[PDB]
């Protein structure tokens with residue numbers, strides 16, 4: 001859309017936050033997201049970090065979200081928005097770029113931010129940072145109680 | 157996209173790494189999937205932390221490219237472990253796999269070939285400081301070329317086209 005928010009942006013961030021909360025309850029990293037079709041607002045998929053739930057080194061919230069959408073024709077991604085509760089790392093940024101997902105709406109980039117947020121813009125994608133305090137507070141709590149687990153999720 | 161860049165020298169485990177990656181690619185091909193494989197080796201002692209191949213068709217996966225599957229197969233690891241490893245891949249990494257190497261801080265990426273495919277990622281890796289070595293493995297090129305020939309529509313799906 002650019003400038004003005006998409007009619008589905010609040011729906012998308014609320015689902016992403018819902019996923020992060022679910023993940024937190026399961027004892028995992030509280031990062032969630034979903035992929036929405038910009039045309040009709042349909043939810044193509046939703047998910048959260050599965051590092052602890054399935055001993056996964058690649059299933060970040062964004063990757064899990066895309067994995068849950070299943071195999072899709074490349075053109076489908078071209079008119080979607082990926083919602084994530086936290087600014088994407090270099091890997092998740094690469095996934096957005098590879099599939100050509102035009103928009104990425106981020107809950108917050110205070111607890112974490114990689115060079116990927118700017119790289120997305122360099123590569124022609126639109127990035128929207130909401131600065132959602134619900135996401136920020138949830139992520140901060142996890143970092144406070146399990147700093148080492150957070151670090152593992154980003155290879156630190 | 158710099159004009160004054162550099163590549164890599166030569167590691168003693170590179171021969172072994174590309175052999176494993178190729179073996180993984182052949183395995184994937186036999187399973188009717190995209191023939192792209194890889195492995196991650198600890199530079200400190202030559203230990204194979206994991207190996208894998210593309211699982212798009214095997215698991216209906218949109219994210220399990222060869223490199224991603226390889227990392228997944230190493231299981232959860234302490235962040236510092238990746239910092240002294242080399243990721244081997246039969247084909248030059250897309251933007252997503254490039255991002256994974258960058259995120260985990262894997263210092264070296266040895267590529268089988270970049271003739272059948274090459275994304276902005278190969279250069280971006282070097283821009284981000286990673287060492288990239290393209291060996292131009294003929295075994296890998298022949299296999300991938302044949303796959304692209306036989307299944308153009310499946311190749312494009314793997315790269316979101």
Ligand SMILES: [Ca+2]
Nearest residue numbers: 304305306307
């Ligand atoms: Ca043909």
Ligand SMILES: [Zn+2]
Nearest residue numbers: 060087088089
């Ligand atoms: Zn992340």
Ligand SMILES: [Zn+2]
Nearest residue numbers: 060089091092
């Ligand atoms: Zn990520």
Ligand SMILES: [Zn+2]
Nearest residue numbers: 221248249250
């Ligand atoms: Zn690839």
Ligand SMILES: [Zn+2]
Nearest residue numbers: 221250252253
């Ligand atoms: Zn890839």
